Amino acid sequence: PLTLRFTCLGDRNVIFFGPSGRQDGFTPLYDPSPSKRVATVDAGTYGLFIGGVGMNGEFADTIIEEARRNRIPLTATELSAESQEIQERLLHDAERQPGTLVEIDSGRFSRVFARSFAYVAIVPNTVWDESETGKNVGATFLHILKPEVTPHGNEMNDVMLYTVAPFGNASDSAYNMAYKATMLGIVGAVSEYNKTPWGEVKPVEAIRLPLLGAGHFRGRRGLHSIGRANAVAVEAAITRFDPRVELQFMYEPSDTALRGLMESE
Ligand SMILES: Nc1ncnc2c1ncn2[C@@H]1O[C@H](COP(=O)(O)OP(=O)(O)OC[C@H]2O[C@@H](O)[C@H](O)[C@@H]2O)[C@@H](O)[C@H]1O
């Protein structure tokens, strides 16, 4: 865990994982024995469902394995549908009221989610043209996981986030604006959540971020430009909310989450 204090983030300690004992080197979504409640961010898709491949595929696999371990019938198709319907409705309310943490008690009708939230810092398809970025970009959700689907059966791994990153082929104008909107949403949701009663009890105290839009949403875009877009976004979000939480950046071979912020440094 490479810890570096960043002056442009107002003297905040940011973590940067190196490679791991994997063929891919990816950081694990959640730790086996964490000291903090770490909410990992799902690199979501336009369909707003949990599944598919990449990092979105990991979340599904992890949730389902833990579900089957606790002898809860949960298939990939059920998780995809149940998560899409929820995040579809929460998106509707979030867009009705930008900059406000909407909510539904998913626990009443869910084997997976105890409680689900959403937050939209900027209405999709206003500041940018979604024809360039894809739809529902910037949207962000926060789910509290029921104990039976909680990674490694650990009470602290009971929070996740889900966001949709801009497609790389978007204009630098549209891309950077979508990326900051995306980051404001993540930090905003956690900020606003920690102010809720559930936040007092189960406060998020760190955020595990992948390099958003650096996988299948990269297209023809260069990883440097993404490191910039990410660096600028974090600066604004930190300046916006002045958050107490700790940012953690997962590992990918190019290490551009760090290089970009070093440029911002
Ligand atoms: N299993 C994985 N675990 C951890 N990190 C991963 C994994 N696979 C890729 N990554 C890395 O996480 C970041 C995001 O990965 P992706 O989700 O593949 O890229 P993204 O453009 O954000 O998402 C595109 C597509 O992939 C699905 O996750 C999702 O359904 C979306 O449609 C990238 O930096 C990538 O290196």
Q: What is the 3-state secondary structure (H, E, C) of the chain?
A: CEEEEEHHHCCEEEEECCCCCCCCCCCCCCCCCCCCCEEEEEEECCCCCCCCCHHHHHHHHHHHHHHHHCCCCCCHHHHHHHHHHHHHHHHHHHHHCCCCCEEECHHHCCCCEEEEEEECCCCCCCCCCHHHHCCCCCCEEEEEECHHHCHHHCHHHCEEEEEECCCCCCCHHHHHHHHHHHHHHHHHHHHHHHCCHHHHHCCCCEEEECCCCCCCCCCCCCHHHHHHHHHHHHHHHHHHHCCCCEEEECCCCCCHHHHHHHHHC
Rounded CA-CA distance 247/206 in Å is: 6
Residues paired with residue 15 on neighbouring β-strands, in sequence order: 3, 248
Chain mean position to CA 33: 21
Distance 253 CA to ligand 1 centre (A): 13
Q: How was this structure determined?
A: X-ray
Query: What are the boundaries of each domain within the chain?
Result: 36-264
The candidate with the shortest Cα–Cα distance to 225, out of 236, 235, 212, is 212
Q: How open is the CA angle 83-84-88, to the nearest 5 degrees?
A: 120
Q: Which two tokens stand for residue 99?
A: 């900059």
Cα–Cα distances in angstroms (integers) from residue 6 to residues 3, 143, 147, in the given order: 10, 29, 35
Which atom of ligand 1 is closest in space to residue 49's alpha carbon? 30
Rounded CA-CA distance 262/13 in Å is: 13
Q: Which two tokens stand for residue 195?
A: 């102010």
Rounded CA-CA distance 218/165 in Å is: 10
Q: How open is the CA angle 63-99-86, to the nearest 5 degrees?
A: 30
36-264, which class in CATH?
alpha beta
Rounded CA-CA distance 135/146 in Å is: 29
Cα–Cα distances in angstroms (integers) from residue 44 to residues 112, 125, 163, 182, 210, in the given order: 17, 17, 5, 11, 11
For the chain, state the CA radius of gyration. Answer: 17
Resolution (A): 2.7
Rounded CA-CA distance 51/259 in Å is: 30
Rounded CA-CA distance 150/47 in Å is: 24
Ligand 1 pocket, Cβ-based, cut-off 6 angstroms: 26, 43, 45, 52-56, 58, 165, 210-217, 250, 252
Query: Residue 134: left if φ>0, alpha if ψ -120 to 50, beta else—which one?
Result: left
53 phi and psi, to 5 degrees? -125, -160
Distance 53 CA to ligand 1 centre (A): 7
- What's the first-to-final CA gap in the chain, in angstroms? 19
Sort strands 102-104 and 113-119 into parallel, antiparallel or unpaired.
antiparallel
Cβ neighbours of 2 (radius 10 Å): 12
Instruction: Among 55, 63, 83, 255, say which to mutate for ligand 1: greatest number of ligand atoms within 8 Å of CB.
Output: 55
Rounded CA-CA distance 22/252 in Å is: 12
Specify whether the CB–CB gap between 24 and 55 falls below 8 A.
no
